[PDB]
Amino acid sequence: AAPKAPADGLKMDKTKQPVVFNHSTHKAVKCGDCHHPVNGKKDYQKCATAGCHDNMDKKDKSAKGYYHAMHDKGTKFKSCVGCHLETAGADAAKKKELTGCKGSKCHS
Q: Nearest 5°: CA angle at 57, between 84 and 41?
A: 60
Does the annotation place 68 within a ligand binding site? Answer: no
42 binds ligand HEC (CB under 6 A): no
Q: Are strands 41-42 and 37-38 parallel, antiparallel or unpaired?
A: antiparallel
Residue 100 three-state SS: coil
Q: Which of 28, 90, 92, 93 binds ligand HEC (CB under 6 A)?
A: 28
Q: Taking the complex as a whole, how short is the minimal distance between the CB of residue 108 and ligand HEC, in angstroms?
A: 11
Please tell me whether residue 18 binds ligand HEC under the rule CB under 6 A.
yes
Site for ligand HEC contains 47 (CB under 6 A): yes
Amino acid at 3: P
